[PDB]
């Protein structure tokens, strides 16, 4: 018989757990052994719209799920699904008896509502989420019976359950309908009397402040909206907090192999914190039984944490990053600044200042020598290879990167000895970067110092999350610094390679929004890119897996010519840390966000072997 929590057991007003539980919960096998109950996990995020960090805490809880090794998704919140013999048709039969976290149940409908009034409403969202679509056409979502679910495209779309286990591709699973209704107006004729109450002056904003989406805090501020989580959120995230606590879900749905409904733990209390050193001091006190996220990806902060797992009694284990980069150089070809525009559109420039670069000496300085010169192309532990993307342009060279700047006609120099336009002033490239990633704004000074020599000038723009990004969807920046994607999957995130990404695909969000729009809007990119955003659809499109193949390595290959971005390092190790006393977390798993790491590795069975 399944049993729970002894936490639940002193709660008189539920139902017993086999009324809680669906009718046939998804069974966890546990990373390394089977759990005992109990604890509180302590765990940190930052405070300015750090929410992510929540959600890559306990996990999406999608249709299907990434397996431990990445390589493929199982039926995860469905109990299975057909795929048709032509993929266009992907049939989710669902769980009979599961319920929401307030106990009403869970059914088709709640994924149809999802789908048809929320992420397929073009007042919600103007632009459908790309997770849903096909060469930019919806599927037809419908309810089969209560507990099955169709999604019909109009093509093939192999990489769907892929997509399903994704951040982005969990919005089925993410509204209930029942409380959701109130707030939208095809439901609720009185809309407009939650507006005051709820401080906006809309139902799309009202919709996104009480039912959320993936990545905005409100996902997280509020203790009644319903969900499917391992935890619940009982002390909110907002503005200026400096704690958020979750607890148990008493209608999870899920049980260990011995019948105990999970999770193992009681709670989750997240530190919010400012600062990233007071984050690294408190993880080194040993104040946190799991930090996977935010230490990991500065290797400088790795010799500290190294040195202090005694002290502060956890194991450090090392993540192999699925980022291609770890510090991109973005380059906008529709930058508003046409004279730079003007060069940011030509090979030889972008070849040039890639040559100027002395990626070792970034690597030895920023990297502790503990990553490697690297473009933006897969790894060779991925079928998505490519020579010429990972390696072209990568050796100091700069009698050739002075040489093709003075063919480019940047001869005419300033009495500060840099080069400038044929028709204008200094050479100079705005690169906005988030101040708080020490390492992207290290690797950054080091290239303005090597550039010098070059005669072009780098200036360094570091801000918050909030500047960065509104700069970037203005279209307003040089060059944008963050990681490129793709080092391992570059299918689930092509962005470095074809500008399909509304947010970061930085080559140009101009070129992506006229993507996702079929051109209406944005900015017509240029013939190369075009082709490839062709090939994009056809490879989504495509009816077999060799196809795909075909199709995809074309696209890698005009990315490979076109040298669109430009890399500097390859990830060094990602350094994680839990808690000696904490078990089942799995130390061999990637790090990234399309696998929400560390809650890949299934936090409703992490334990404690020992409290305290
Ligand atoms: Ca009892
Ligand atoms: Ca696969
Ligand atoms: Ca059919
Ligand atoms: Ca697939
Ligand atoms: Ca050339
Ligand atoms: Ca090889």
Known sequence: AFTQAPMLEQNKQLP???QRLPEKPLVIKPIASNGVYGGTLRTVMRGNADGNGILRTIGPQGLTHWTQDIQTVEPYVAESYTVSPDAMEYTFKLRKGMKWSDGTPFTADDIVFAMNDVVLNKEMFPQTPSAYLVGGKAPKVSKVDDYTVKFEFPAANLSFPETLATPLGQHPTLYQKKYCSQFHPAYNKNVQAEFTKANVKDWPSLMRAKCSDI??????????????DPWLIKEPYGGAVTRVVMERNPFYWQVDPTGKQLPYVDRIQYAVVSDLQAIILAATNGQYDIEARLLGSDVTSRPLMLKNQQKGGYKVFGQTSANANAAGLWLNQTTKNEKLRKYMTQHDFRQALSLAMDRDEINKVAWLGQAAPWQSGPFKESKWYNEKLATQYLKLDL???????????????????????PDGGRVSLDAIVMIDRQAMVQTLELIRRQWQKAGVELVIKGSERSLFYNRATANDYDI??????????????????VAVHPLESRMSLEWAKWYLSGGKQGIEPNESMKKRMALYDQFV???????????????LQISADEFEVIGTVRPAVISSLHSLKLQNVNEKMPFGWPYATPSLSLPQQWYFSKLE
């Open 215 to 228: 990545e905005l805090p409100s996902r997280w501020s509020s203790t009644e909206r319903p969900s499917i």
């Open 541 to 555: 499109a495509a009816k077999t897996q060799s196809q795909a193949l075909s199709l995809f390595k074309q696209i």
């Open 480 to 497: 944008s610094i963050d990681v490129f994607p793709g080092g391992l999957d570059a299918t689930l995130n092509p962005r470095a390679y």
């Open 399 to 421: 009698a050739q990167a002075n040489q093709i700047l003075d063919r480019l006609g940047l001869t005419k120099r300033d009495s500060d000895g840099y080069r400038t336009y």
């Open 16 to 18: 017993p757990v086999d």
